[PDB]
DNA sequence: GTATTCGCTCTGCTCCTTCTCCCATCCTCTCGATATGAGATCAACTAG
RNA sequence: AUCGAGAGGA
DNA sequence: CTAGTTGATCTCATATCAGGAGAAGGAGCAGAGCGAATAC
């Protein structure tokens, strides 16, 4: 057995399975428990965070550490598609735990409130969804839970969302977030997460804005003055030091050599609008609606969504072999057809993502048009069948392509059976695309994976790619290093409506550090 | 720019003189000065 | 007490633009500041900011 | 042991200040200003 | 249509 | 019984001077009246 500082023992057979970084994470989690503080397991997608949590909880119950003897009644809030995944991992890794699902699928077949009461009074693990936490906040918080692990806790990123306010009602100090991307659009998200795990460190949201968000963000713009860049550097370093003890973020670069993952590629194809697609795009950017948008009269959403649809496929004006969604009318669909042909002749398995459900239906129709054997999972599929479906695609290699929406197909599922991954449509949030592309390159991937991220050249999609590159740079400025190069590719203004198709310290080290920070 | 002396029957002043002084070229609006007489050492 | 719609009718205009009544606009103001104040008193807010 | 005051309170009296209210009825005309989809939940089916 | 304004009538 | 399809509904997320009159309160002074308090 592995013996930690005070009284925490994790069983030897369980400990041996874990990798070096995973047991380092268990150590860190128990140091947080000693401090009675929350944390973010920021390890990227696929590095293993369900296993670290399961091992830490198993050692906590096993160790009988001193209301609660060992482990109390814990609640795990996760996306609906991964609830049964958590159940399976708990059963395989620590079968002694009672692990009930609070969901319509569930296993209880009686009043839910009875299930919450039973798990609370039995010191079991209640896995629930974020929607249920919002809905059952009256009952979920009356029972003095011990641990409130939030899997994919970046769903709490909006400080004013009802789910966030619900999840911030738990009285316990032991609040954990599992999310390999705990910053997706700006630093408000980081503040929301750190308000959840440890309400005090980053102060009130106004104060956090004034001290960190405006300095750090405003120093990343292309026109930033050098003094402002240095101020942003100072603020980013301060924030990194502030959030260091409670963020544990391991990359797949410092762990890849110690984990034997196969090679990865992250190509970004710039697809070409077809003549008809280009015509529709040019007609729309020349229309009066976009003119009204640029004048501030109407909301930008109509034009933005229309351009995204046009780049996806001209489903605005639905033009035999001229049915709705015909592949040859969209350039990205032509590229996807070529890629699918090549990969099928190479005997490989492909993971085809989409932001839009309608574009997913169009891709599904195009796949039946070919002889490809597909398998689809979007928000409409019943949750109870989602983990089965994933297992199916992970089990038999007869299934060639796995269609997905990035909101359901991403976000914590394991699809290591897939070999190639193609992100058909960019999103405004970089993190959606990141999780979608890490669905394949995970622990258990025995083959070389590559990611093909399709963008239409000179369209709104390239501008979205630029916006999310800027967001990723802003995130890296505070997650990996503060020396981040300024985003210079664009100014990120409201001219994304244009078509531009190509062709003890002894008071001296401390004083020295104060001088260093102030001279910046 | 003319001094006008009036007397309000119901007031704390027996007599109050005013001038709405205004520089001839319209640089500014007229500024009024009052020189009053406190009502009835 | 929010009054009903008949106390504050939304009169339609020569086109389709539905003009709301002064009471409706004022209830909009009360609602926005009430919601905003609610989120401040629920969260940590400066006593003078709450005031 | 009673004068005699005497400090302290209890109204109470003018007065000045604030503030709030009101200011005929009815009728005609002109003129200017004044989002969208994905995911989740649930409930009705809609059939096996 | 509403609001306001103005000009009028007895 | 019992899973799969269909609609409604909610959440969440994507950027960039030429009034006047009266009533209610508070203010400061004035005194009256009674307890104690020296003191002849
Ligand atoms: N120590 C381990 N030994 C064997 N398999 C592991 C280990 N850690 C993680 N895995 C596997 O890697 C996959 C990804 O882990 P998981 O925690 O589910 O994803 P994430 O950490 O990205 O949330 C899981 O299917 C899990 O079974
Ligand atoms: F971070 Be995910 F669960 F892979
Ligand atoms: Mg996970």
XYZ file of C-alpha atoms (C1' of nucleotides) and ligand atoms in Angstrom:
742
model
C 0.000 0.000 0.000
C 1.006 3.624 -0.585
C 1.189 5.710 2.595
C 0.798 9.488 2.317
C 1.586 12.198 4.830
C -0.858 11.825 7.735
C -3.333 8.936 7.497
C -4.204 8.426 3.833
C -3.641 4.956 2.390
C -4.583 3.926 -1.146
C -4.506 0.145 -1.798
C -1.399 -1.231 -3.445
C -3.214 -3.072 -6.226
C -5.191 0.072 -7.060
C -2.133 2.323 -6.733
C -0.012 0.128 -9.015
C -2.391 0.577 -11.951
C -2.091 4.374 -11.838
C 0.661 6.127 -13.768
C 3.188 8.456 -12.157
C 1.290 11.638 -13.016
C -2.018 10.081 -11.944
C -0.736 9.225 -8.478
C 0.841 12.679 -8.319
C -2.688 13.927 -8.941
C -4.019 11.735 -6.137
C -1.354 13.220 -3.852
C -2.429 16.720 -4.888
C -6.120 15.935 -4.361
C -5.445 14.729 -0.833
C -3.305 17.784 -0.083
C -6.344 19.823 -1.111
C -8.488 17.666 1.175
C -6.113 18.373 4.059
C -6.352 22.075 3.250
C -10.155 21.694 2.955
C -9.965 23.507 -0.385
C -11.250 22.753 -3.858
C -9.342 22.242 -7.065
C -9.383 21.813 -10.818
C -7.916 18.674 -12.356
C -6.911 20.538 -15.502
C -5.214 17.557 -17.153
C -6.116 17.551 -20.830
C -8.707 15.263 -22.366
C -7.725 11.603 -22.263
C -4.939 11.841 -19.683
C -7.223 10.176 -17.136
C -9.183 12.159 -14.561
C -12.038 9.781 -13.826
C -9.404 7.276 -12.707
C -7.574 9.793 -10.517
C -10.830 10.792 -8.811
C -11.893 7.167 -8.394
C -8.528 6.211 -6.896
C -8.525 9.194 -4.538
C -12.064 8.459 -3.332
C -11.227 4.763 -2.969
C -8.215 5.637 -0.837
C -10.286 8.119 1.155
C -12.942 5.535 2.022
C -10.316 2.807 2.473
C -8.179 4.970 4.772
C -11.035 5.543 7.266
C -9.712 9.069 7.758
C -11.328 11.429 10.252
C -19.599 13.550 10.780
C -18.097 11.400 8.002
C -15.982 8.315 8.697
C -13.854 7.898 5.590
C -15.976 8.912 2.599
C -19.317 10.629 3.028
C -22.141 10.918 0.496
C -20.617 12.431 -2.638
C -22.315 13.876 -5.718
C -20.718 13.763 -9.174
C -22.188 16.173 -11.730
C -21.273 15.240 -15.301
C -22.690 15.569 -18.821
C -25.536 13.207 -19.588
C -23.536 11.156 -22.095
C -20.875 10.129 -19.542
C -22.973 9.223 -16.485
C -22.958 5.503 -17.265
C -19.289 5.908 -18.168
C -18.641 7.067 -14.605
C -20.705 4.142 -13.330
C -18.653 1.661 -15.363
C -15.335 3.147 -14.245
C -16.395 3.120 -10.588
C -17.571 -0.489 -10.819
C -14.389 -1.703 -12.514
C -11.953 0.305 -10.373
C -13.626 0.375 -6.919
C -16.583 -2.051 -6.923
C -17.276 -1.541 -3.174
C -18.859 1.862 -3.862
C -22.607 2.137 -4.332
C -22.933 4.349 -7.407
C -26.465 5.424 -8.324
C -27.557 7.593 -11.256
C -30.044 10.410 -10.630
C -31.598 10.518 -14.092
C -34.623 9.428 -16.099
C -32.566 6.509 -17.407
C -31.345 5.695 -13.903
C -31.892 2.398 -12.118
C -34.237 3.317 -9.271
C -37.841 3.172 -10.577
C -39.284 5.207 -7.679
C -39.358 8.831 -6.543
C -35.993 10.441 -7.224
C -36.015 12.329 -3.915
C -36.038 8.929 -2.231
C -32.881 8.088 -4.199
C -31.104 11.258 -3.084
C -32.163 10.532 0.503
C -30.920 6.939 0.276
C -27.543 7.933 -1.154
C -27.174 10.720 1.413
C -27.923 8.401 4.351
C -25.912 5.492 2.869
C -22.740 7.466 1.980
C -22.989 6.456 -1.670
C -22.018 8.230 -4.879
C -24.862 10.034 -6.649
C -24.060 10.712 -10.307
C -26.373 13.366 -11.732
C -26.574 15.716 -14.708
C -26.181 19.477 -14.707
C -29.823 19.874 -15.717
C -30.902 17.836 -12.690
C -28.695 19.906 -10.375
C -30.431 23.005 -11.714
C -33.870 21.396 -11.402
C -33.457 19.554 -8.077
C -31.404 22.199 -6.270
C -34.083 22.245 -3.559
C -33.502 18.570 -2.687
C -29.885 18.120 -3.784
C -28.735 20.666 -1.179
C -30.301 19.609 2.084
C -28.094 16.611 2.910
C -24.542 17.807 3.758
C -22.626 16.128 0.961
C -18.916 15.437 1.332
C -17.663 15.827 -2.264
C -19.187 17.734 -5.184
C -16.914 16.673 -8.075
C -18.073 18.347 -11.312
C -16.920 16.453 -14.389
C -16.472 18.849 -17.299
C -17.038 21.611 -14.762
C -16.408 24.273 -17.398
C -20.201 24.153 -17.807
C -20.065 26.395 -14.707
C -18.121 28.984 -16.743
C -21.049 31.413 -17.011
C -21.234 33.037 -13.538
C -24.906 33.987 -14.016
C -26.233 30.727 -15.476
C -28.785 28.919 -13.334
C -26.577 25.816 -13.311
C -23.679 27.839 -11.895
C -25.792 29.396 -9.149
C -27.167 25.947 -8.312
C -23.747 24.280 -8.150
C -22.491 27.112 -5.925
C -25.037 26.230 -3.188
C -23.171 23.175 -1.869
C -21.891 23.897 1.630
C -18.950 21.480 1.593
C -15.406 22.810 1.018
C -14.419 19.775 -1.060
C -15.341 21.029 -4.525
C -13.522 19.487 -7.494
C -13.804 20.271 -11.208
C -12.595 17.866 -13.892
C -12.099 19.755 -17.147
C -9.137 19.549 -19.484
C -9.984 23.053 -20.753
C -10.935 25.240 -17.773
C -10.732 28.417 -19.875
C -12.559 28.672 -23.187
C -13.499 32.272 -24.079
C -12.075 34.699 -21.496
C -10.998 35.050 -17.872
C -14.570 35.430 -16.585
C -14.800 31.662 -17.037
C -11.710 31.136 -14.892
C -13.227 33.391 -12.246
C -16.472 31.413 -12.279
C -14.652 28.102 -11.868
C -12.426 29.423 -9.083
C -15.434 30.939 -7.348
C -16.920 27.451 -7.366
C -13.905 25.581 -6.008
C -12.523 28.231 -3.624
C -14.806 31.286 -3.419
C -12.211 33.710 -2.063
C -8.939 33.471 -4.009
C -10.046 35.468 -7.011
C -12.102 38.194 -5.406
C -15.483 39.591 -6.355
C -16.062 39.486 -10.104
C -15.749 43.298 -10.534
C -12.406 43.216 -8.735
C -11.167 40.256 -10.774
C -12.184 42.030 -13.977
C -10.417 45.274 -13.081
C -7.254 43.582 -11.799
C -6.779 40.737 -14.315
C -9.245 40.603 -17.196
C -8.768 44.089 -18.644
C -4.946 44.142 -18.205
C -4.313 40.590 -19.427
C -6.761 40.706 -22.338
C -5.994 44.256 -23.477
C -2.280 43.439 -23.693
C -2.926 40.637 -26.184
C -4.384 42.824 -28.920
C -2.200 43.501 -31.943
C -2.066 47.261 -31.302
C -0.904 46.792 -27.696
C 1.758 49.242 -26.576
C 4.933 47.685 -25.114
C 4.206 49.087 -21.646
C 0.724 47.584 -21.798
C 2.215 44.250 -22.890
C 4.509 44.308 -19.858
C 1.554 45.148 -17.602
C -0.350 42.194 -19.055
C 2.705 40.012 -18.435
C 2.852 41.114 -14.801
C -0.856 40.476 -14.268
C -0.667 37.078 -15.980
C 2.272 36.039 -13.799
C 0.402 37.204 -10.697
C -2.671 35.220 -11.726
C -0.607 32.108 -12.486
C 1.007 32.268 -9.053
C -2.419 32.865 -7.509
C -4.036 29.837 -9.185
C -1.044 27.476 -9.039
C -1.893 25.413 -5.909
C -5.481 24.724 -7.020
C -4.965 24.032 -10.746
C -3.273 20.760 -11.719
C -2.885 20.842 -15.505
C -0.675 18.184 -17.093
C -0.176 18.232 -20.856
C 0.201 15.364 -23.295
C 3.786 16.510 -23.820
C 5.130 16.049 -20.290
C 3.220 12.741 -20.007
C 3.312 11.491 -23.605
C 6.775 9.952 -23.260
C 5.732 8.338 -19.958
C 2.474 6.992 -21.447
C 3.422 5.508 -24.864
C 0.825 7.339 -26.937
C 1.080 7.099 -30.748
C 1.895 10.034 -32.992
C -0.529 12.913 -33.614
C -1.106 15.380 -36.444
C -3.255 18.524 -36.393
C -3.538 19.586 -40.029
C -5.915 22.410 -40.974
C -7.278 22.154 -44.514
C -8.460 25.402 -46.117
C -11.320 24.301 -48.344
C -12.553 26.212 -51.393
C -16.094 27.470 -51.915
C -17.777 26.028 -54.985
C -19.125 28.257 -57.742
C -22.698 27.913 -56.466
C -21.663 28.165 -52.813
C -19.487 31.189 -53.601
C -22.378 32.752 -55.519
C -24.777 32.330 -52.588
C -22.185 33.702 -50.160
C -21.477 36.718 -52.379
C -25.194 37.392 -52.789
C -25.722 37.276 -49.021
C -22.790 39.550 -48.140
C -24.193 41.915 -50.790
C -27.714 41.655 -49.344
C -29.487 44.366 -47.376
C -29.644 42.324 -44.158
C -25.869 42.380 -43.676
C -25.907 46.081 -44.562
C -28.392 46.647 -41.739
C -26.239 44.500 -39.434
C -23.140 46.601 -40.123
C -25.175 49.728 -39.298
C -26.099 48.307 -35.879
C -29.819 48.196 -36.679
C -30.223 44.399 -36.430
C -28.504 41.735 -34.367
C -25.413 40.142 -35.890
C -26.651 36.612 -35.188
C -28.816 36.233 -38.291
C -25.975 37.091 -40.652
C -23.402 35.092 -38.694
C -25.547 31.948 -38.653
C -26.506 32.401 -42.307
C -22.859 32.636 -43.358
C -21.972 29.602 -41.243
C -24.790 27.645 -42.896
C -23.644 28.741 -46.359
C -20.075 27.631 -45.662
C -21.355 24.341 -44.235
C -23.630 23.743 -47.231
C -26.080 25.942 -49.211
C -29.159 24.748 -47.331
C -30.665 28.255 -47.500
C -31.722 27.795 -51.135
C -32.188 24.037 -51.520
C -31.331 23.481 -55.179
C -31.932 13.651 -60.422
C -28.907 13.914 -58.051
C -30.017 17.423 -57.051
C -31.706 16.534 -53.763
C -31.370 18.552 -50.575
C -27.811 18.412 -49.285
C -26.087 17.049 -52.389
C -22.401 16.737 -51.581
C -21.010 18.252 -54.793
C -22.535 21.674 -54.020
C -20.236 22.219 -50.998
C -16.455 22.355 -51.141
C -15.942 20.976 -47.645
C -18.200 18.061 -48.558
C -16.068 17.435 -51.664
C -12.933 17.370 -49.509
C -14.691 15.077 -47.031
C -15.681 12.747 -49.871
C -12.066 12.532 -51.035
C -10.783 11.982 -47.490
C -13.365 9.288 -46.769
C -12.476 7.479 -49.996
C -8.753 7.577 -49.190
C -9.193 6.488 -45.574
C -11.615 3.691 -46.462
C -9.121 2.337 -48.986
C -6.550 2.555 -46.164
C -8.763 0.488 -43.841
C -9.081 3.165 -41.159
C -11.888 4.451 -38.949
C -13.018 8.074 -39.037
C -14.694 10.378 -36.518
C -16.717 13.043 -38.339
C -17.730 16.012 -36.179
C -20.116 18.883 -36.841
C -21.320 21.939 -34.954
C -24.746 21.844 -36.630
C -27.300 19.065 -36.271
C -28.676 19.904 -39.726
C -25.232 19.585 -41.289
C -24.903 16.278 -39.444
C -28.115 15.107 -41.120
C -26.753 16.233 -44.494
C -23.527 14.315 -43.844
C -25.594 11.278 -42.818
C -27.536 11.430 -46.085
C -24.279 11.737 -48.022
C -22.910 8.714 -46.155
C -25.915 6.576 -47.056
C -25.433 7.813 -50.626
C -22.062 6.101 -50.462
C -21.765 2.544 -49.150
C -20.048 3.654 -45.932
C -21.316 2.046 -42.737
C -21.864 4.921 -40.313
C -23.097 5.442 -36.768
C -24.679 8.657 -35.521
C -24.967 10.272 -32.093
C -26.381 13.783 -31.651
C -28.495 15.532 -29.025
C -31.655 13.788 -30.250
C -30.452 10.242 -29.538
C -31.705 8.863 -26.237
C -29.084 9.208 -23.513
C -29.501 5.589 -22.395
C -28.230 4.368 -25.788
C -25.263 6.739 -26.086
C -22.686 4.785 -24.073
C -23.812 1.553 -25.780
C -23.359 3.221 -29.186
C -19.865 4.387 -28.237
C -19.008 0.877 -27.067
C -20.332 -0.483 -30.359
C -18.043 1.813 -32.322
C -15.184 0.880 -30.004
C -15.863 -2.851 -30.383
C -16.480 -3.818 -34.034
C -14.363 -2.242 -36.769
C -17.013 -2.870 -39.438
C -18.424 0.559 -38.583
C -16.379 3.051 -40.606
C -17.481 6.606 -39.745
C -18.857 7.946 -36.461
C -20.983 11.058 -36.981
C -21.046 13.408 -34.003
C -22.135 16.784 -32.784
C -19.247 18.391 -30.945
C -21.411 19.197 -27.907
C -22.461 15.565 -27.355
C -19.767 13.691 -29.272
C -17.083 15.685 -27.494
C -17.067 16.285 -23.763
C -15.564 13.306 -22.032
C -16.519 10.232 -24.077
C -13.880 7.690 -25.124
C -13.732 6.829 -28.836
C -10.268 5.315 -29.147
C -11.601 2.906 -31.768
C -11.662 5.878 -34.123
C -8.400 6.474 -35.968
C -8.881 9.636 -38.066
C -10.843 12.648 -36.826
C -12.274 15.410 -39.025
C -13.784 18.580 -37.551
C -16.101 19.650 -40.352
C -17.177 23.060 -39.019
C -15.300 25.486 -36.731
C -16.952 26.814 -33.591
C -16.642 30.170 -31.873
C -15.390 28.380 -28.769
C -11.953 26.795 -29.385
C -12.487 24.342 -26.536
C -15.376 22.612 -28.312
C -13.044 21.788 -31.197
C -10.214 20.814 -28.840
C -12.312 18.299 -26.916
C -13.785 16.971 -30.161
C -10.291 16.345 -31.534
C -9.056 14.757 -28.284
C -11.946 12.270 -28.390
C -9.579 9.980 -30.355
C -6.064 10.651 -28.991
C -6.527 9.162 -25.529
C -5.200 6.431 -23.260
C -5.933 3.247 -25.209
C -5.377 4.644 -28.720
C -3.159 2.010 -30.346
C -2.867 3.745 -33.748
C -1.515 6.997 -35.137
C -4.261 9.641 -35.153
C -4.577 12.797 -37.233
C -6.993 15.715 -36.951
C -8.267 17.435 -40.097
C -9.970 20.733 -39.283
C -11.881 21.979 -42.318
C -12.203 25.714 -42.968
C -13.486 27.501 -46.058
C -10.816 29.917 -47.251
C -11.685 33.606 -47.151
C -15.078 32.986 -45.523
C -16.581 33.497 -42.074
C -15.067 30.159 -41.041
C -11.510 31.464 -41.366
C -12.475 34.499 -39.287
C -13.912 32.192 -36.613
C -10.659 30.234 -36.697
C -8.841 33.520 -36.089
C -11.139 34.464 -33.194
C -10.566 31.115 -31.524
C -6.809 31.315 -32.141
C -6.930 34.630 -30.285
C -8.933 32.958 -27.514
C -6.442 30.083 -27.349
C -3.559 32.556 -27.098
C -5.360 34.377 -24.290
C -5.818 31.037 -22.522
C -2.197 29.954 -22.995
C -1.124 33.336 -21.610
C -2.333 32.185 -18.166
C -2.312 28.363 -18.403
C 1.099 27.419 -19.876
C 3.237 30.585 -19.935
C 2.840 34.390 -19.787
C 5.364 35.109 -22.588
C 2.675 34.468 -25.203
C 3.216 36.082 -28.594
C 0.654 38.749 -29.446
C -2.109 37.844 -31.887
C -1.099 39.766 -35.018
C -2.947 37.887 -37.787
C -5.978 40.190 -37.457
C -7.475 43.034 -35.435
C -10.716 41.061 -34.827
C -13.183 43.750 -35.890
C -16.718 43.571 -37.304
C -15.676 43.036 -40.933
C -16.111 39.256 -40.883
C -19.062 39.736 -43.281
C -16.724 39.991 -46.294
C -15.956 37.366 -48.940
C -12.236 37.281 -49.795
C -11.791 33.909 -51.485
C -8.112 33.215 -52.312
C -6.425 33.021 -55.715
C 11.174 32.130 6.011
C 12.407 34.312 3.155
C 15.129 36.646 4.429
C 13.553 39.843 3.033
C 15.990 39.895 0.072
C 14.643 37.274 -2.301
C 11.234 38.680 -1.384
C 12.374 42.279 -1.871
C 14.134 41.279 -5.089
C 10.926 39.692 -6.378
C 8.933 42.799 -5.465
C 11.421 44.946 -7.386
C 11.305 42.551 -10.342
C 7.509 42.639 -10.506
C 7.385 46.420 -10.126
C 10.009 47.157 -12.791
C 7.911 45.280 -15.375
C -26.958 95.412 -18.741
C -29.457 97.830 -17.172
C -29.967 98.251 -13.444
C -33.601 97.812 -12.456
C -34.760 98.537 -8.918
C -38.052 96.939 -7.890
C -39.747 96.413 -4.530
C -41.589 93.203 -3.754
C -44.386 93.721 -1.237
C -44.108 90.158 0.141
C -40.390 89.513 0.600
C -37.449 89.839 2.970
C -36.117 92.762 0.929
C -37.520 96.245 0.866
C -35.672 96.850 -2.418
C -33.604 94.699 -4.799
C -31.590 95.937 -7.780
C -30.491 93.615 -10.562
C -28.441 93.735 -13.736
C -28.412 90.955 -16.327
C -24.948 91.773 -17.524
C -23.999 90.364 -20.910
C -20.879 91.007 -22.963
C -22.009 92.567 -26.228
C -20.432 89.977 -28.501
C -22.396 86.838 -27.672
C -19.492 84.934 -26.162
C -21.634 83.730 -23.277
C -25.180 83.801 -21.913
C -26.222 86.732 -19.780
C -24.959 86.526 -16.191
C -27.199 88.184 -13.613
C -25.938 90.057 -10.564
C -28.326 91.058 -7.789
C -27.590 93.752 -5.229
C -30.387 93.537 -2.692
C -31.478 95.343 0.469
C -32.071 93.199 3.548
C -35.481 93.649 5.101
C -35.859 95.775 8.208
C -28.528 97.211 14.575
C -48.099 44.139 -8.191
C -47.690 44.027 -11.934
C -51.028 45.162 -13.411
C -52.589 43.292 -16.310
C -52.249 44.122 -19.977
C -55.458 46.176 -20.142
C -54.099 48.692 -17.634
C -51.020 49.103 -19.887
C -52.104 48.210 -23.428
C -49.485 47.635 -26.113
C -51.051 49.695 -28.889
C -50.168 48.713 -32.437
C -48.882 51.411 -34.691
C -49.451 52.093 -38.417
C -47.088 49.220 -39.248
C -46.209 46.236 -37.049
C -44.085 48.008 -34.403
C -45.897 47.359 -31.104
C -45.385 50.382 -28.845
C -45.477 49.546 -25.158
C -47.043 51.712 -22.473
C -45.138 53.861 -19.970
C -46.028 51.436 -17.182
C -44.568 48.550 -19.183
C -41.303 50.431 -19.749
C -41.146 51.296 -16.061
C -41.758 47.694 -15.069
C -38.907 46.863 -17.411
C -36.701 49.232 -15.432
C -37.839 47.830 -12.080
C -37.326 44.264 -13.281
C -33.863 44.854 -14.652
C -32.585 46.598 -11.536
C -34.376 44.081 -9.315
C -32.715 41.138 -11.058
C -29.351 42.905 -11.065
C -29.654 43.843 -7.394
C -30.739 40.297 -6.606
C -27.603 38.829 -8.127
C -25.512 41.360 -6.201
C -27.122 40.709 -2.796
C -26.927 36.969 -3.466
C -23.222 37.282 -4.300
C -20.562 39.331 -2.539
C -21.285 42.992 -3.175
C -19.996 46.155 -1.557
C -22.371 47.451 1.095
C -22.322 50.835 -0.619
C -22.835 49.137 -3.995
C -25.790 47.203 -2.589
C -26.988 50.479 -1.086
C -37.720 74.379 59.436
C -38.117 77.092 56.568
C -36.369 80.600 53.383
C -34.460 80.391 49.277
C -32.535 79.321 46.044
C -31.955 76.455 42.178
C -31.354 72.915 38.832
C -33.965 70.445 35.875
C -38.069 69.227 33.393
C -42.504 70.118 30.998
C -44.795 71.956 28.346
C -46.117 75.784 25.256
C -45.809 79.579 22.350
C -44.480 82.169 17.823
C -42.101 81.552 14.041
C -39.631 80.051 10.351
C -39.175 76.130 7.044
C -40.924 72.441 4.197
C -43.938 70.595 1.525
C -47.927 69.531 -0.885
C -51.972 70.981 -3.209
C -54.694 73.834 -6.641
C -55.284 76.873 -10.538
C -63.571 77.087 -15.787
C -66.145 74.225 -19.426
C -66.589 72.301 -23.876
C -65.224 72.040 -29.093
C -61.976 72.168 -33.965
C -57.642 71.832 -36.615
C -52.427 71.065 -37.787
C -47.739 69.519 -36.799
C -43.449 66.713 -34.931
C -41.775 62.594 -32.541
C -42.259 57.822 -31.347
C -31.710 35.938 -33.453
C -30.849 30.774 -33.829
C -29.885 26.321 -32.841
C -28.176 22.285 -29.675
C -29.101 19.690 -25.636
C -32.079 18.230 -21.792
C -36.701 17.118 -19.719
C -40.962 15.672 -19.856
C -45.248 14.381 -21.661
C -47.880 12.034 -25.161
C -47.977 9.156 -28.046
C -46.860 5.055 -30.997
C -46.290 1.569 -31.797
C -43.289 -3.539 -30.424
C -52.397 54.891 -32.871
C -50.139 57.458 -28.677
C -47.753 61.620 -26.704
C -46.603 66.462 -26.799
C -46.878 71.158 -28.916
C -49.155 75.101 -31.311
C -53.131 77.835 -33.464
C -58.144 78.683 -33.102
C -63.854 78.661 -31.676
C -67.989 79.700 -27.865
C -44.979 -4.256 -20.014
C -41.988 -1.240 -22.923
C -38.711 1.051 -25.825
C -38.736 4.567 -29.978
C -40.868 9.022 -32.234
C -43.044 13.887 -31.639
C -43.905 18.306 -29.712
C -43.398 22.011 -26.133
C -40.414 24.441 -23.127
C -36.092 26.056 -20.839
C -31.131 26.915 -20.736
C -27.182 28.340 -22.743
C -24.095 29.953 -25.960
C -21.953 32.224 -29.996
C -19.499 39.811 -30.609
C -18.509 43.796 -30.553
C -38.639 87.087 -12.525
C -44.775 88.730 -11.919
C -47.977 82.098 -7.075
C -50.263 81.471 -3.237
C -52.253 79.274 0.844
C -52.453 76.397 4.295
C -50.959 72.509 7.407
C -47.180 69.862 9.771
C -42.331 69.842 12.129
C -38.605 71.598 14.506
C -36.284 75.560 17.097
C -35.355 78.526 20.456
C -36.979 81.115 24.291
C -39.933 81.917 28.235
C -41.700 80.705 32.061
C -43.915 77.745 35.626
C -43.335 74.264 39.055
C -41.317 71.007 41.904
C -37.436 68.092 43.522
C -33.325 68.693 45.933
C -29.861 71.590 48.466
C -27.430 75.055 51.227
C -28.069 77.956 54.887
C -29.941 81.451 58.320
N -4.211 4.186 -15.002
C -4.977 3.767 -16.032
N -4.944 2.487 -16.455
C -5.698 2.052 -17.479
N -6.539 2.852 -18.156
C -6.673 4.159 -17.837
C -5.880 4.702 -16.731
N -6.196 6.004 -16.629
C -7.115 6.278 -17.588
N -7.398 5.174 -18.302
C -8.352 5.096 -19.431
O -8.219 6.261 -20.243
C -9.498 6.712 -20.686
C -9.636 8.210 -20.436
O -9.752 8.460 -19.040
P -10.913 9.426 -18.485
O -10.564 9.878 -17.091
O -12.230 8.732 -18.720
O -10.894 10.707 -19.460
P -10.507 12.186 -18.949
O -9.394 12.009 -17.952
O -10.067 12.907 -20.194
O -11.801 12.687 -18.358
C -10.552 5.903 -19.945
O -11.270 5.077 -20.863
C -9.790 5.058 -18.945
O -10.294 3.720 -18.898
F -11.491 15.576 -20.189
Be -12.360 14.476 -20.875
F -13.101 13.707 -19.757
F -11.521 13.514 -21.725
Mg -13.808 12.565 -18.220
